[PDB]
Amino acid sequence: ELFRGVLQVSSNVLDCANDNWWCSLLDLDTSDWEPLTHTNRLMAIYLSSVASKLDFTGGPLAGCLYFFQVECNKFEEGYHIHVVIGGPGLNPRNLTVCVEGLFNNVLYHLVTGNVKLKFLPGMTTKGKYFRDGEQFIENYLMKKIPLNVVWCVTNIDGYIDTCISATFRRG
């Protein structure tokens, strides 16, 4: 059982990227992927940085399974990040504040000003949080090919290698 939701990264967020974001030394495995350039690369650096921070973050996020996937916004400029996450410390009450706190903590090092993302939990119109995160990964997120999917990070055993494999995602 994993929760899921979406954050937005507007173009104004990308306008505020500092040189530590742009000149990141992170080299990402694109040997089975489309090239990562311009703001697509920035987004890929951010997800990798968020993933690395989460790996070493405890409290409510300790032991959590996560699957992050960033994609372009089809009608407007910018991006959205698909967040599938669950764990023993996470629950419908602290989900938003923990996810938002994590993504904004990492983001703060990469922007010149104060810019804050909003996490919108996947839920019914009566407020029941979605718990179909695993199914959402398998039926939807993993079926996208680059650059419909821009970048992806996960710690889930089923996808550690496949998540950034264009060949896997095609078949």
Author numbering: 2 to 172
Please quote the authors directly.
The nuclease domain of NS1 (NS1_Nuc) is responsible for DNA Ori binding and nicking that is critical for B19V viral DNA replication. NS1 contains one nuclease domain (Nuc, aa 1–176), one helicase domain (aa 302–457) and one transactivation domain (TAD, aa 523–531). NS1 belongs to the HUH-endonuclease superfamily and it shares conserved ssDNA cleavage mechanism with other HUH-endonuclease members. NS1_Nuc is of α/β fold in nature.
Totally, two NS1_Nuc structures (Form I and Form II) were solved. The Form II structure belongs to P21 space group. It was refined to 2.2-Å resolution with final Rwork and Rfree of 22.3 % and 25.8 %, respectively. Different from the Form I structure, there are two NS1_Nuc molecules within the asymmetric unit of the Form II structure. Superposition showed that the overall folding of NS1_Nuc is very similar in the two structures; the root mean square deviation (RMSD) value is 0.8 Å, based on 169 pairs of Cα atoms. The conformations of the α-helices and -strands are well conserved, but NS1_Nuc does show some conformational changes, especially in the βlinker and β4-β5 linker regions. Compared to the Form II structure, Glu77 is shifted about 7.3 Å in the Form I structure. As observed in the Form I and Form II NS1_Nuc structures, Leu121 can adopt two different conformations, but neither are compatible with A-5 in the WDV Rep/ssDNA complex structure. However, as supported by the clear 2Fo-Fc electron density maps, Arg94 is well defined and adopts similar conformations in our NS1_Nuc structures. The β4-α5linker contains two highly conserved Lys residues, Lys127 and Lys129. Different from Arg94, both Lys127 and Lys129 can undergo subtle conformational changes.
